[PDB]
Amino acid sequence: LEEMLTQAVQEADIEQVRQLLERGADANFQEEEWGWSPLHSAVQMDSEDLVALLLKHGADPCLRKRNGATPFIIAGITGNVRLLQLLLPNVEDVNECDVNGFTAFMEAAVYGRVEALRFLYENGADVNMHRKTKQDQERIRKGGATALMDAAEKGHVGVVTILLHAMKAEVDARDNMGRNALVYALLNPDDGKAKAITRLLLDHGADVNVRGEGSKTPLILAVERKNLDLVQMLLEQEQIEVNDTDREGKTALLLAVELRLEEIAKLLCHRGASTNCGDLVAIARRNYDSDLVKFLRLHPPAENWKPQSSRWGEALKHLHRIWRPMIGKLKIFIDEEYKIADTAEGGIYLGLYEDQEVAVKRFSEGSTRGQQEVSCLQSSRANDNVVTFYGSESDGSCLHVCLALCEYTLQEHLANHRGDAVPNEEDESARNILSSLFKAIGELHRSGYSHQDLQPQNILIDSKNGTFLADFDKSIKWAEDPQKIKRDLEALGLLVLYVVKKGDISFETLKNQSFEEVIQGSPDEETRDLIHHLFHPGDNVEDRLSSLLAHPFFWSWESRYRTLRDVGNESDIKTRNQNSRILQLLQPGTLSTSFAQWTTKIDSFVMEEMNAYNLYQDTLGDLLKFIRNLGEHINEQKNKKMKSIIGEPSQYFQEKFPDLVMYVYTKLQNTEYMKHFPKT
Amino acid sequence: SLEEMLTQAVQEADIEQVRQLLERGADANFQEEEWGWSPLHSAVQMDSEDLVALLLKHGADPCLRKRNGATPFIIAGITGNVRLLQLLLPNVEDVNECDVNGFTAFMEAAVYGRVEALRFLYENGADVNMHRKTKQDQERIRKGGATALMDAAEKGHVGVVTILLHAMKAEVDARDNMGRNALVYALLNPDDGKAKAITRLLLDHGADVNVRGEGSKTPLILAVERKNLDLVQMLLEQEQIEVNDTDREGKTALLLAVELRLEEIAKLLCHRGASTNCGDLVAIARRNYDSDLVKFLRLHNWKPQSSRWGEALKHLHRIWRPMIGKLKIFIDEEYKIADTAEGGIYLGLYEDQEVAVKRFSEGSTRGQQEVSCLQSSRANDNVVTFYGSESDGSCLHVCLALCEYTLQEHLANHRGDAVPNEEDESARNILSSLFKAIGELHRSGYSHQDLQPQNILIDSKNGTFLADFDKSIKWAEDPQKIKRDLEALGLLVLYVVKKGDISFETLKNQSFEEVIQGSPDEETRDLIHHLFHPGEDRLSSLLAHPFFWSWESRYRTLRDVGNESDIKTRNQNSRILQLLQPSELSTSFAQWTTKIDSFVMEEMNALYQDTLGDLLKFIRNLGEHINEQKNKKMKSIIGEPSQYFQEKFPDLVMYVYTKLQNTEYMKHFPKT
Ligand SMILES: Nc1ncnc2c1ncn2[C@@H]1O[C@H](COP(=O)(O)O[C@@H]2[C@H](O)[C@@H](COP(=O)(O)O[C@@H]3[C@H](O)[C@@H](COP(=O)(O)O)O[C@H]3n3cnc4c(N)ncnc43)O[C@H]2n2cnc3c(N)ncnc32)[C@@H](O)[C@H]1O
Ligand SMILES: Nc1ncnc2c1ncn2[C@@H]1O[C@H](COP(=O)(O)O[C@@H]2[C@H](O)[C@@H](COP(=O)(O)O[C@@H]3[C@H](O)[C@@H](COP(=O)(O)O)O[C@H]3n3cnc4c(N)ncnc43)O[C@H]2n2cnc3c(N)ncnc32)[C@@H](O)[C@H]1O
Ligand SMILES: CCCCOC(=O)c1ccc(O)cc1
Ligand SMILES: CCCCOC(=O)c1ccc(O)cc1
């Protein structure tokens, strides 16, 4: 309303800029997003009188914006030379600069403003001055460039010629990296202008063995340019070092052959390039360049690269060996030897991404499934049980998403390890796989995605038994539809049974069972109870996966036995105090379980020495008291024939009483006696 | 050895030696099994009339395929020599035979600009209008499908384009499986002159100019992005071009015309009805310093996930800046998070994701191996996640996961959450994460070389991460420097147990004996001792040290040992009792019976003396009975039993652990 009123200095309606400071407006007010003044914005705009009128009323031409720039320094851009006259007698130093080191003179140069450049020249502008930025852009070797180097790279060949001859400029000045004006010139895409500037620079003495980005020489920048005349112009100078290399060990001539440039290559041999830094007749061969193989005849490397994968090892050693073009950071070969699996689109192949072994999922460049795989992958880099995502690269027609390379599918993994477990033993491996999937899906959901198609083909296991989620091309952002989360939790129900039964029941058999059949298929009570909570997670999913990680399904056998004994040691169970708080949680009001008359179901010998004191009753309390008492003494020397008949006590009590830990868990679940549960 | 010198003789163009070793029996159809090359293949590729004619005479058939499936006939389209093409034509069933990717002889005459071969194949039935038919793993990706014309277009072969459309039936507006016609192919040739000519021929034959391609670009949008005034003019001469069509990003031809600072392209796109409201365009000429374009336009929500850096990133998303590859960054103190030796650390947006950006000089040795180490750590869950690098030619930007706090800040922010002699569970969680992270780094072949609380990061969910790998080394080259990491870790163990109260530089200035005396407990001293005196993947095994045992777990282990039969029956020749009896210095629990509260000991004797065996039996017995009502005034004087026995006998857990460490009685340690 107030100072925003002289938005009118932008409308260039000067009667509204005249009048509305007539009522009072701070011509030096600076909007502080970027610090522009009316007097700044007038010179960028180039107006005789919008400038003169603000000058007319005390607006100072040296106030700086965020960039650090003056109305003088930006007046070097517009190139208007008595806009510079109207504010020349108001400038302390004609070589004032902005925060990045730019003087009025240096910016007449980058914008080709020739009349501006000579007016500032004979009023004391330093043509040779290097740019002085802040120290955080100096400890990375920026700054130090001259006016000459930006007249160079921007192609102002008119502005360049005047600097070397009329203005004394320093041709072989370097910037803080070491580049001279020369390398700036050969980064200009304009072929004509790049040719003219470099001939002007060279004949005044630019060092032609400087280096630039990539450690390339000027000659290597000419070759990668595919430009015949710069290669010959540069070699016309007889101190050129032909066999110099970039950071990657390639000489100019090696690239000359690689990129199928016959005559470019022919002159660098004719001028002393090395015929021995690589296999150069092999490269011209595979480039179908008959005339260049022909001439290269008339005038090896041992190999370490270890793949980390064992299954894919020998296929990836081979792909390291063969020559392939790069698709970005990615080396790939569509061939059946490197094929991992078939997709609806493109399949998945092996790969080398920045020399790391990867799996490559190939999508068509437009495909919706691809864009949906990538976004979800991008929200999951913090999810430790999602396959690591290295990055995408597209060849303009086909998108390659590159992922951490794994060894086996969950289904393959369960097959290869079906025989490692004694029939009569604890399945720790099932708990590990399934707990990783709970976390993986839990984190996926907190990140706002639902997978929508989990099944053992999408679950990956790597060289060290980690399990990973993969294949997110059917995923959805679930915020717009929060009840769709429930399909991930039914699939998890199916997978809990899939893994507990060790792969014996195919996943597709399960996908055709009703919920109630799969529950009956559960082998034990912990498992049936867990699956139930995955099929009925509530209109209240929230984060039901995290709490289930505390289910007794995930308790070891030692932990289960420990909890049963620790409850059994509470004071009121040993004294059989039925009005206690613990006994009223476990057995209030009067059956129907596997441990009613539990005294009946343990063998009569073991029952008799436990009555080395009335006696034990058909109480759940007394059965926990029992477990505690035998727990503390099963190993003592008087009781070796007890120990022999019980077997391992944890297994004994669980298989004789299948529902017991689930019952105790259920009764103590949200009570102080939770403290006896194992740590989660 | 017989067929191997036939091959190098055919590459040596030694035709008298190829004569000799063919009559001596060399299989002229032998194929090397890496790529499927035959002598007759190498003969056509090499362009030699005489090697070819000689092999043909000896049964070498032009139907053998290499790995790609290409025959010497198809390779003869590449060589372009038209008298090798005569000598193998009457030996091929089908002049449009193709390799696995769909390439015919005609089609390779087009990509290699071989006009004389191109018209020889045309007058023997070569199909000019054929699209490329590949295999299903290049087929379900809508790849392929290009014509001879689309290839001659992209390659700028101005001679071959004229003959296909005029002399040879070519179809100007044929599409490939992606939908591109020859037009978009033409406007990818970098040569401005040749791209200009191909475009005028395609246009005059009826090429549809409302194709879209790669990037959802229209031909007009690639004419602007090429910055070719004369190419934009040819396309607009046709009056059904859809000017106000846009690419995948909603950016229009004129929007791009203003952004990339070219006046005359913009002036001619307004005069033909481009939309002056597809963006705010006079602000764009404003920001690009063109006064002549401001003159002419006179005539006409995103949520960050970070909390500390939230409002700074809302601002950086708002403002305009150029991209360095995938990286949006602005160097200003408002976005500075921390300072490095070189370049500092800033916020950034990488493919519109939050990152911290470490800036190095493009040549720097340190920047280079922050990255080398970062790439070997993608599997390491406790190293900061690494997104990728981007260079602007002067300065390498490595972009990493953004975290909330340094360890030192995190210990400050939670310093008051703690009761004074609380069990410090959080110290165990931080430090075990650090053990896992440094353990994983070492297995990957790197040593950090400068661990310090400023390099340890804490994210929105109390996870800890290692960062700053610019002093790191591959440790093969000097395996004795890993010791620098394990000492830093010893220092960090004390630093975290002291809750941040002792500064890291103070610890770096203490000697080893001062750091040991500064440790508050026996578990902590022993752990630091082993980090300073280790033996190759020791970090994983130390995670089983009682330092990482909770207080209940330590009390549990003592009770479980205390319940062993020979400890309760005091059989001194048993195995357990003989491990527990070394020799050793004096401990706080020799004469442990004296050091208890005198009331408590008397009800426990319903013959305790000062063996370690008996004190574990003591632990075991009081463990199982301390909570019965008969012992309520005993329970009041001990308090919590784990704390009592640890505080009366500070060395007990460590002593038992040492005695049982590599024995069967390991079974009583908590599961780690
Ligand atoms: N009247 C106005 N009112 C209100 N707002 C306005 C007004 N006018 C413009 N705006 C808004 O301000 C925003 C930025 O304002 P600004 O132009 O003053 O500052 C730019 C940038 O912020 C600020 C820092 O930009 P950066 O982060 O990219 O940093 C730049 C680069 O990283 C480094 C290059 O040097 P080196 O390492 O190569 O040696 O220095 C900067 N730089 C490069 N060329 C420069 C140049 N000719 N002149 C000045 N600085 C240059 O400098 C301005 N700028 C950037 N490139 C420029 C270039 N080629 N030519 C002229 N100025 C340039 C604009 O976006 C716009 O929204
Ligand atoms: N005399 C010899 N003796 C022994 N070994 C030899 C000999 N000569 C060369 N070698 C070694 O053979 C190895 C593979 O070279 P090759 O020519 O046999 O097989 C190539 C590649 O492997 C194999 C697959 O390569 P690619 O996966 O990159 O797949 C390429 C592309 O993505 C796909 C479809 O392209 P498009 O339809 O989307 O346009 O086909 C390939 N292709 C592209 N241009 C082609 C063209 N003109 N003609 C035929 N195929 C072309 O096909 C050969 N090839 C590729 N590009 C070629 C091209 N422009 N011109 C000619 N042949 C090409 C070489 O590396 C070399 O080591
Ligand atoms: C059975 C071995 C499969 C290897 O496949 C992969 O590594 C892989 C990675 C990510 C995917 O989305 C699919 C497969
Ligand atoms: C206190 C929060 C710091 C956030 O900094 C980072 O995320 C970061 C990441 C990698 C580094 O090397 C430095 C900082």
CSV table of N, CA and C in Angstrom, one decimal, chain B residues 26 30 35 49 94 104 113 118 132 137-138 170 229 238 249 265 303 322 384 396 399 455 490-491 546 576 588 595 607:
chain,number,residue,atom,x,y,z
B,26,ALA,N,41.1,-75.2,-43.1
B,26,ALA,CA,40.5,-74.3,-42.1
B,26,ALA,C,39.0,-74.1,-42.4
B,30,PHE,N,34.0,-71.2,-39.1
B,30,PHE,CA,34.3,-71.1,-37.7
B,30,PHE,C,33.8,-69.8,-37.1
B,35,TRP,N,31.4,-63.3,-29.6
B,35,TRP,CA,30.4,-62.5,-30.3
B,35,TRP,C,29.9,-63.1,-31.6
B,49,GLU,N,37.6,-56.7,-51.4
B,49,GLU,CA,37.0,-57.6,-52.4
B,49,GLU,C,37.7,-59.0,-52.4
B,94,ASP,N,16.4,-63.9,-48.7
B,94,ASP,CA,15.6,-62.7,-48.4
B,94,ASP,C,16.5,-61.5,-48.2
B,104,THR,N,18.1,-54.4,-41.3
B,104,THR,CA,18.3,-55.0,-42.6
B,104,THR,C,19.6,-54.3,-43.2
B,113,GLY,N,25.1,-43.9,-44.2
B,113,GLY,CA,25.2,-42.9,-45.3
B,113,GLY,C,25.7,-43.5,-46.6
B,118,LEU,N,22.7,-48.0,-51.1
B,118,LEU,CA,21.3,-47.8,-50.7
B,118,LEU,C,20.4,-47.9,-52.0
B,132,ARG,N,11.5,-51.5,-37.4
B,132,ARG,CA,12.4,-52.5,-36.7
B,132,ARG,C,11.6,-53.3,-35.7
B,137,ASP,N,11.8,-58.2,-24.8
B,137,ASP,CA,12.3,-57.4,-23.7
B,137,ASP,C,12.8,-56.1,-24.2
B,138,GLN,N,12.8,-55.8,-25.5
B,138,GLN,CA,12.9,-54.5,-26.0
B,138,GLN,C,11.5,-54.0,-26.6
B,170,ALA,N,9.6,-43.4,-49.9
B,170,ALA,CA,9.6,-43.3,-48.4
B,170,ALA,C,8.3,-42.6,-47.9
B,229,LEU,N,16.6,-20.1,-34.4
B,229,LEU,CA,15.6,-19.3,-35.0
B,229,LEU,C,15.1,-19.8,-36.3
B,238,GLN,N,3.6,-23.7,-41.1
B,238,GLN,CA,2.5,-24.6,-41.2
B,238,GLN,C,1.5,-24.2,-40.1
B,249,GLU,N,6.3,-31.3,-18.2
B,249,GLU,CA,6.4,-30.4,-17.1
B,249,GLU,C,5.5,-29.1,-17.2
B,265,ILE,N,13.1,-15.3,-31.0
B,265,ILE,CA,12.3,-16.5,-30.9
B,265,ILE,C,11.0,-16.2,-30.1
B,303,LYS,N,5.2,-29.7,1.2
B,303,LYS,CA,5.5,-29.9,2.6
B,303,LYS,C,6.9,-30.5,2.8
B,322,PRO,N,18.7,-21.9,-11.0
B,322,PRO,CA,19.1,-22.9,-12.0
B,322,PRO,C,19.4,-24.3,-11.3
B,384,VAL,N,25.0,-42.3,6.8
B,384,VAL,CA,24.0,-41.3,6.1
B,384,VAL,C,23.8,-41.8,4.7
B,396,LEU,N,32.1,-29.9,-7.1
B,396,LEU,CA,31.4,-31.2,-7.0
B,396,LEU,C,30.5,-31.1,-5.8
B,399,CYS,N,25.4,-35.1,-2.4
B,399,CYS,CA,24.1,-34.9,-1.8
B,399,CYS,C,23.7,-36.0,-0.9
B,455,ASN,N,30.5,-35.4,13.5
B,455,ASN,CA,30.3,-36.2,12.4
B,455,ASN,C,29.2,-37.3,12.6
B,490,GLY,N,36.7,-45.4,21.5
B,490,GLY,CA,36.8,-45.4,23.0
B,490,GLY,C,36.5,-44.0,23.6
B,491,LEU,N,37.1,-43.0,23.0
B,491,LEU,CA,36.7,-41.6,23.4
B,491,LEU,C,35.2,-41.4,23.3
B,546,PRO,N,29.4,-56.9,28.4
B,546,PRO,CA,28.4,-56.5,29.4
B,546,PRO,C,28.1,-55.0,29.5
B,576,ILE,N,32.4,-75.6,36.8
B,576,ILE,CA,32.0,-74.2,37.1
B,576,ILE,C,32.9,-73.6,38.2
B,588,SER,N,36.5,-56.3,45.1
B,588,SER,CA,35.6,-55.7,46.1
B,588,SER,C,34.7,-56.7,46.7
B,595,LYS,N,30.4,-56.8,53.8
B,595,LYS,CA,30.1,-55.6,53.2
B,595,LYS,C,28.6,-55.4,52.9
B,607,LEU,N,25.5,-71.3,56.2
B,607,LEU,CA,27.0,-71.3,56.1
B,607,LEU,C,27.6,-70.5,55.0
